[PDB]
Design a protein around this ligand. Structure first.
Ligand SMILES: CCCCCCCCCCCCCCCCCC(=O)OC[C@H](COP(=O)([O-])OCC(O)COP(=O)([O-])OC[C@@H](COC(=O)CCCCCCCCCCCCCCCCC)OC(=O)CCCCCCCCCCCCCCCCC)OC(=O)CCCCCCCCCCCCCCCCC
Ligand SMILES: CCCCCCCCCCCCCCCCCC(=O)OC[C@H](COP(=O)([O-])OCC[N+](C)(C)C)OC(=O)CCCCCCCCCCCCCCCCC
Ligand SMILES: CCCCCCCCCCCCCCCCCC(=O)OC[C@H](COP(=O)([O-])OCC[N+](C)(C)C)OC(=O)CCCCCCCCCCCCCCCCC
Ligand SMILES: CCCCCCCCCCCCCCCCCCCC(=O)O[C@H](COC(=O)CCCCCCCCCCCCCC)COP(=O)(O)OCCN
Ligand SMILES: CCCCCCCCCCCCCCCCCCCC(=O)O[C@H](COC(=O)CCCCCCCCCCCCCC)COP(=O)(O)OCCN
Ligand code: HEC
Ligand code: HEM
Ligand code: HEM
Ligand code: HEM
Ligand SMILES: CCCCCCCCCCCCO[C@@H]1O[C@H](CO)[C@@H](O[C@H]2O[C@H](CO)[C@@H](O)[C@H](O)[C@H]2O)[C@H](O)[C@H]1O
Ligand SMILES: CCCCCCCCCCCCO[C@@H]1O[C@H](CO)[C@@H](O[C@H]2O[C@H](CO)[C@@H](O)[C@H](O)[C@H]2O)[C@H](O)[C@H]1O
Ligand SMILES: CCCCCCCCCCC1=C(C)C(=O)C(OC)=C(OC)C1=O
Ligand code: FES
Lengths: 244, 71, 54, 55, 124, 75, 85, 383, 165
């Protein structure tokens, strides 16, 4: 296939979480949630994430309950069996912008914006692909490219024509921690947050793996000693043959 | 302003200058070819995607680490 | 060495008791040690490090 | 007793009567008659408001 | 493949002057690179024995040959498990690589194959 | 070469202190450490693995319930 | 073809004396450094060609195929690709 | 008499794991059998655990796997352990089969354990194929579609059989629920056959790297091979740890994190890496039925190794030409694997055909020729 | 003694297998039977309550319990078949006993053809009984309440086990 059909391969960026012993930067996670909430959530759902998931990762219990309580969710019917709404709870999932695929496509010139809960695991590249894509819209498509109607040129996207326009521009978000919200900064934060959303066990997994590596290595060393100890009578065996 | 704007420009003029030239030459040719009549009824229309990828791949190699260092 | 052998090693009941008690101690101390080490190499990154802002 | 749900207002102590083995709970939900050993357990509940309790 | 087959084909080659001229040097190099002599084996020690015919041939070995084969197998097994090679007198020299077993198996097979032929005889 | 009473040379391998309690104790220290890490590793493995059967996070989220009291009449 | 202890199916053994020493009497890692360096070098040297020759051949074949495939799907390779299909 | 020998139940265990007489010179390539037993045990423990939290209904399957990753305590571990051990199972099984082919383990008197082994290998393929469908991501669905459509090539009844397998007219809920049930069962069938091949082996015992009898010099299985098996168990667990904790998705396809969509077709539908050589062999034959026959034949041809190997000597330790041919055969099998995942483009199309011819010609021409000639070289060379 | 002792375990495995399988229907008897039988574990001192919550995977019988019972119900018959095999292998050291209680070492008959063909008679007798239930009276041995979907609120009139328990 042509390189265009594949898409340009994203650079390998030095993410904080790269590194056998490295966690996510949780300050970046928090900022990335705020980009999701104020930019991406217009078109993209995050359906696998519940409010309780943010607690002790990006937000306190109170902040997350406040986010939940601002929304209305379907309650069980009342006593006359009429529909009712309730305020959200920590167990609720983050609600998406559209009621169904048809509504989603209608708002996006036919394209369906995917759910972003698994997108970091569902694309080759992970965080690097998300960062590369969001920051890789050239001002002008390379001379000769004919974009289909409602398409935007982005070399990282396979085929080059993506139905999502550029959305991150300097200062579309005002971070609550005072960080300068440049295109690059917002893309890095949101890519980190989405990577967390795809693999929230990441931090615990790598720490348990450190414990496993240490124990298993020690056991490997000791198993070598013990095998050699038990095998030494066989290895050291000597013979004298006197033909009968 | 976006740190990447300046880093990318620096990398294009500097370590990726050969690739920048090739992309530039390509665009000149393709625009000129589009300007000519009976271009729409041609069999093969050249693009500049290949040269663009060579340039971008190069810029990314010379920038990735520098950019993340200043975020 | 004789004394140590006689008390903790000679009887398998005592040897297994010693091994299990050591496993208990190792398990608890290793937990604490890794926790501290992990927190130092990932300092300022974890929720517990930013929690105070909120 | 075993883990059926008592029918309320019924009983002999006019609180709750478990139909399963005939154990009678009170208006406090205390066991009075029948095989049941304990009074109906109390959840951990708090009055956030005077009009709403959380359980 | 039967030892009979191998021995017959080899004798056809050794007969033809041309063939022997080109095959014998190859076969000698093959044997040197094979490296079984470096574990103190003779070639015949390597022949598969878990066959009725080979069990019979091994039972017909003279006791001395039999005892020495057992020792070479045990010694080679010890070199194998230790990851060592034979040195000195344990290396099989080319003159010691004698076909002690070939005559016994060729007799066993001669009878086995004659029996198969005669089981298919047709009175004319 | 011939006499079976002349033991082959084992001097490259023999320890001088082979009969001492220190000598045995060392090898039991290795065996014991290995048993200790195997015990600690098994305990960790069993505990973490079986915990899958305890209430999952979504079940733990479905616990605390709020009920109004204005609707409920006397008696 | 295999028996059991006491009647394993060995031809009669006679004339071999076998000797060994206790695992507690022996140094389990005796001669380890010499083995790790010289024994491993010998063993590896003697097997090296049987790995090197097939690996190098198949890697060269793959390299040629993958480079040509890459080239055929460039602009430069348009004509050669057209013929190939 | 010792209880372990006297009591019939204990004696069966004893005969396999304690008093079992083994050659004294097995090398580390004899350790894959116990690694395969370890993979099988891990897969049973993790698989039964996943079954406690997985839902086989197509509307819920993919989400039940997300629930496992996100909400079940250590669900991520159990899921990644199960997924990665499926790959390790195939690394160990290829190693084990490679050991068997290099050391002549298929020769008399071990034709029966080898032949049962070939069936174990087919059962592993079916087990792993069905388990992969259970996720019901894009690769799950589209992989099931293309592999199950190969059955349509069976003449006359092929289409009918496909609809019967699917339980409908395409891969859907009926197919997913039946694959769950069969995926649960197949590992138990596989464990029975694994046991059968060992019982069959026990009549000759293990072969050894020299290819001679070990009846002259036996070692108890315990403690010698027990403690030698621990070394590779810990080596395996270290490799397992590096994947499961540090790189859990390296061996997978990102498309399997997209929910199955019968409408959208993925860019490239490829099998799991361990099936790739067989897929390359299938692509090599232009005919549909031809390709399926070739693919199956590539596995069943292992059954003729006892015949086509004409050597008077067991195994390759002392056969320099056979060793070179084995090296080429193995590297070709890895090339086929690589070609299984390239696009159907020049020049990989022709290369795949050449590699497929080489694969079959090993069994049918080269091994019979080389083994015949080496017989003659051993005889003339040692005269 | 050994085939008999393994037999006692086979019997316990059958009880557990059949108990879990009955829950899988998730009718009223399924749910309420699971509730009452699993609560017996609460009687284990100190840890009993914790063990029950662990078995349920929650605070009452629900979805986690049903999905785990499915997985274990699938497994338990395979465990049971292994133990059935073990008790036979254990038996093979003495052979079958016989109705007189004496040795049969004096007078043995091959299992086939004699007991093969004698087993066919009872196989067909069994299949006739099977047929009468499965085709003509399929619900005679069951409880009608198990055709009502599980309702944690409403308790059935009487919760009894399957007849064999
Ligand atoms: C997966 C899960 C992880 C578990 C790991 C298990 C793998 C262990 C195993 O089977 O291989 C170890 C194995 C060591 O096993 P060993 O029992 O010492 O000897 C087995 C060989 O038959 C002995 O072969 P040898 O004595 O002729 O030694 C040959 C070896 C040298 O082997 C040494 O280790 C030295 O070196 C090579 O052949 C390298 C080729 C040259 C490349 C340049 O490594 C090899 O020898 C690999 C050679 C394959 C080519
Ligand atoms: C995995 C489970 C590990 C359990 C460890 C508990 C102690 C057992 C152990 O490590 O082996 C010591 C013991 C004995 O090891 P041993 O056989 O070397 O010790 C016998 C000789 N004395 C008592 C003089 C030291 O192992 C067993 O009893 C078997 C248990 C295996 C684990
Ligand atoms: C890659 C190509 C492999 C070439 C192997 C050639 C032999 C060699 O050098 O190996 C070292 C060793 C040589 O061991 P050896 O037993 O022949 O010799 C030991 C040393 N002497 C001769 C002195 C006694 O070979 C092995 O251990 C081979 C095991 C083969 C496993 C292959 C797995 C591949 C999976 C594909 C499945 C289909
Ligand atoms: C089934 C899959 C088998 C593979 C096991 C690999 C490790 C799985 C355990 C999880 C883990 O990471 O454990 C770490 C320690 O590593 C360890 O210590 C575990 C490595 C041990 C390797 C071999 C030990 C036994 C494995 C199998 C025995 C099973 C028998 C009984 C279950 C973390 O420690 P933590 O903090 O999570 O621990 C809790 C008590 N502090
Ligand atoms: C985690 C998994 C490994 C941990 C268990 C290993 C044993 C721990 C220490 C105990 C020990 O060394 O004592 C021996 C027990 O080993 C034994 O009795 C077992 C020996 C090795 C353990 C496992 C054997 C593996 C072989 C096959 C692997 C199968 C993988 C498939 C799942 C007895 O020492 P001694 O008996 O030598 O005598 C010595 C005098 N009594
Ligand atoms: C107002 C519309 C809109 C906004 C705002 C938006 N997107 Fe999208 N996005 C889309 C559409 C439409 C697609 C599908 C594009 C296609 O498939 O052609 C898409 C696709 C994507 C993809 C997948 C591309 C692929 O490989 O399939 C990712 C990743 C993505 N968006 C992330 C983001 C992030 C991160 C943000 C903002 C911080 C964002 N989007 C903001 C409309 C939007
Ligand atoms: C689940 C898969 C399998 C398991 C658990 C398994 C296990 C074992 C074990 C424990 C042994 C004895 C020790 C050893 O040599 O490694 C063995 C030997 C053997 N296996 Fe397997 N095996 C499996 C699959 C296979 C397959 C797929 C084949 C063949 C295609 C095979 C053929 C053999 C042969 C021929 C031997 C005897 C080798 C010898 O000692 O010379 N096995 N297996
Ligand atoms: C030889 C043994 C086995 C092999 C090779 C095997 C292989 C696989 C594979 C490849 C998958 C796809 C994994 C993924 O990408 O997520 C899978 C999934 C699954 N397997 Fe198995 N499996 C085995 C045994 C079992 C057993 C015994 C069970 C018992 C039910 C089981 C239950 C499951 C379940 C429920 C899933 C789907 C959940 C998931 O994807 O993780 N497996 N298996
Ligand atoms: C799945 C369940 C079982 C199966 C398939 C099974 C099968 C058999 C078979 C085929 C025999 C030999 C023929 C016969 O005597 O009927 C037998 C004998 C026996 N079984 Fe079972 N059995 C099972 C459960 C049990 C249980 C629960 C017990 C004990 C509590 C038991 C104890 C025995 C004993 C003691 C014998 C030998 C009796 C004799 O021949 O004198 N079995 N079983
Ligand atoms: C055959 C076995 C027979 C009986 C065995 C009974 C074992 C079953 C008990 C499960 C116990 C789990 O109990 C709970 O485990 C988890 C880890 O799993 C621990 O959790 C701790 O370590 C884990 C990682 O290991 C971290 O994610 C967590 O933040 C930390 O609190 C809890 O501190 C402990 O309370
Ligand atoms: C590997 C997993 C561990 C579990 C063991 C596998 C269970 C299935 C094993 C039973 C199958 C029958 O297996 C068969 O048993 C008998 C006795 O046990 C063995 O018989 C062998 O040992 C006994 C004494 O140990 C001797 O009387 C006999 O001369 C010898 O051949 C057979 O060599 C073995 O083939
Ligand atoms: C459920 C059936 C699985 C069969 C495998 C279980 C046996 C465990 C492996 C032990 C083993 C056996 C039996 C064995 O025979 C052998 O010698 C060749 C080994 O080590 C070199 C082994 O490791
Ligand atoms: S169940 Fe309540 S009275 Fe027995």
């Amino acid at each position: 296939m042509t390189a265009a059909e594949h898409g340009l391969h994203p650079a390998e960026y030095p993410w904080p979480q790269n590194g056998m012993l490295s966690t996510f930067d949780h300050a970046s996670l928090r900022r990335g949630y705020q980009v999701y909430k104020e930019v991406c959530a217009a078109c993209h759902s995050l359906d696998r994430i519940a409010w309780r998931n943010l607690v002790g990762v990006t937000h306190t219990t109170d902040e997350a309950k406040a986010f939940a309580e601002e929304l209305e969710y379907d309650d069980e019917p009342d006593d006359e069996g009429n529909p009712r709404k309730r305020p959200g709870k920590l167990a609720d999932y983050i609600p998406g912008p559209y009621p169904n695929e048809q509504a989603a496509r209608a708002a996006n010139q036919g394209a369906l914006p995917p759910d972003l809960s698994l997108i970091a695991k569902a694309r080759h590249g992970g965080a690097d692909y998300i960062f590369a894509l969001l920051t890789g819209y050239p001002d002008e498509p390379p001379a000769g490219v004919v974009l289909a109607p409602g398409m935007n040129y982005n070399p990282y996207f396979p085929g080059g024509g993506i139905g999502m326009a550029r959305t991150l521009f300097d200062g579309v978000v005002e971070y609550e921690d005072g960080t300068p919200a440049t295109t690059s900064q917002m893309a890095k934060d949101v890519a980190a947050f989405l990577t967390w959303a795809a693999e929230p066990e990441h931090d615990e997994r790598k720490k348990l793996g450190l414990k496993a590596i240490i124990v298993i290595s020690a056991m490997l060393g000791l198993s070598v000693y013990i095998k050699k100890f038990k095998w030494s009578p066989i290895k050291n065996r000597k013979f004298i043959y006197n033909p009968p | 302003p976006d740190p990447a704007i300046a880093l990318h420009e620096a990398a294009a003029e500097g370590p990726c200058h050969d690739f920048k030239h090739h992309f530039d030459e390509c665009v000149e040719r393709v625009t000129k070819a589009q300007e000519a009549e009976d271009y729409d009824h041609a069999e093969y229309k050249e693009d500049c995607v290949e040269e663009f990828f060579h340039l971008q791949h190069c810029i990314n190699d010379n920038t990735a680490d520098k950019l993340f260092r200043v975020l | 060495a004789t004394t140590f052998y006689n008390v903790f090693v000679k009887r398998n009941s005592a040897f297994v008791a010693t091994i299990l008690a050591s496993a208990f101690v190792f398990d608890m101390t290793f937990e604490t040690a890794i926790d501290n080490f992990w927190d130092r190499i990932n300092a300022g990154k974890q929720w517990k490090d930013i929690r105070h802002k909120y | 007793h075993l883990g059926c749900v008592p029918i309320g207002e019924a009983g002999d102590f006019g609180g709750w009567f478990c139909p399963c083995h005939g154990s009678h709970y009170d208006i406090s939900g205390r066991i009075r008659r029948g095989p049941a050993p304990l009074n109906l357990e109390i959840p951990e509940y708090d009055f956030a408001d005077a009009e709403t309790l959380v359980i | 493949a039967s030892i009979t087959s191998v021995v017959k084909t080899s004798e056809l080659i050794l007969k033809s002057p041309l063939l022997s001229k080109i095959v014998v040097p190859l076969a000698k190099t093959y044997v040197k690179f094979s490296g079984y002599r470096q574990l103190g084996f003779k070639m015949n020690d390597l022949i598969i024995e878990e066959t009725p015919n080979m069990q019979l041939a091994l039972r017909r070995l003279p006791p001395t040959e039999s005892y020495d084969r057992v020792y070479r197998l045990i010694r080679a097994t010890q070199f194998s498990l230790s990851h060592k090679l034979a040195t000195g007198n344990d290396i099989t020299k080319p003159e010691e690589d004698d076909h002690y077993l070939i005559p016994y198996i060729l007799d066993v097979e001669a009878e086995a194959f004659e029996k198969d032929a005669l089981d298919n005889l047709e009175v004319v | 070469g011939k006499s079976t009473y002349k033991i082959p040379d084992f001097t490259p391998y023999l320890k001088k202190d082979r009969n001492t309690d220190a000598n045995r104790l060392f090898s039991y220290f290795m065996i014991g450490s290995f048993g200790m890490l195997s015990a600690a590793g098994a305990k960790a493995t069993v505990q973490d693995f079986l915990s899958n059967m305890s209430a999952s996070a979504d079940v733990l989220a479905m616990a605390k319930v709020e009920v109004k009291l204005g609707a409920i009449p006397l008696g | 073809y295999m028996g059991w202890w006491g009647h394993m199916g060995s031809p009669p053994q006679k004339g071999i004396a076998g000797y060994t020493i206790s695992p507690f009497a022996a140094r389990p890692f005796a001669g380890v450094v010499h083995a790790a360096i010289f024994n491993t070098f010998r063993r590896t040297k003697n097997q090296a060609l049987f790995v090197i020759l097939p690996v190098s051949f198949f890697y060269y074949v793959w390299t040629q195929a993958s480079e040509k495939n890459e080239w055929l799907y460039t602009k430069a390779g348009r004509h050669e690709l057209a013929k190939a299909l | 008499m010792a209880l372990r020998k006297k009591n019939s139940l204990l004696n069966m265990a004893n005969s396999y794991v304690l008093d079992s007489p083994q050659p004294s010179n097995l090398n580390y390539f004899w350790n894959f059998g116990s690694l395969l037993a370890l993979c099988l045990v891990i897969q049973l423990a993790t698989g039964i655990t996943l079954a406690m939290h997985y839902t086989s209904h197509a509307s819920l399957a993919f989400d039940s796997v997300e629930h496992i990753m996100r909400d079940v305590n250590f669900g991520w571990f159990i899921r990644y352990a199960h997924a990665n051990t499926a790959s390790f199972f195939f690394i160990c099984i290829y190693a084990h089969m490679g050991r068997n082919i290099y050391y002549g383990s298929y020769k008399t008197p071990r034709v029966l354990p080898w032949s049962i082994g070939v069936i174990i290998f087919l059962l592993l393929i079916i087990t792993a194929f069905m388990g992969y469908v259970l996720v019901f991501g894009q690769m799950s669905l589209w992989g099931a579609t293309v592999i199950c459509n190969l059955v349509s090539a069976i003449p006359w009844l092929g289409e009918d059989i496909v609809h019967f397998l699917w339980g409908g007219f395409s891969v859907g809920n009926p197919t997913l629920q039946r694959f769950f049930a069969l995926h649960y069962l197949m590992p138990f069938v596989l464990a029975v056959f694994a046991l059968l091949h060992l019982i069959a082996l026990h009549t000759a015992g293990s072969s050894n790297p020299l290819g001679i009898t070990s009846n002259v010099d036996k070692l108890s299985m315990h403690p010698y091979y027990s403690f030698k098996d621990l070394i590779t168990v810990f080596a395996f667990l270290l490799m397992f740890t590096l994947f499961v904790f540090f790189s859990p998705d390296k061996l997978g396809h990102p498309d399997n994190y997209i929910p199955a969509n019968p409408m959208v077709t993925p860019a490239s539908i490829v099998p799991e890496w361990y099936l790739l050589p067989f897929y390359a062999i299938l692509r090599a034959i232009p005919d549909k039925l031809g390709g399926v026959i070739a693919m199956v034949a590539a596995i069943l041809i292992l059954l003729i190794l006892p015949i086509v190997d004409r050597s008077i000597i067991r195994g390759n330790a002392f056969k320099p030409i056979s060793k070179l041919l084995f090296g080429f055969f193995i590297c070709n099998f890895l090339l086929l694997g690589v070609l299984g995942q390239v696009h159907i483009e020049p020049p990989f199309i022709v290369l795949g055909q050449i590699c497929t011819i080489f694969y079959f010609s090993y069994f049918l021409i080269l091994l019979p020729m080389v083994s015949t000639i080496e017989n003659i070289f051993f005889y003339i060379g040692s005269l």
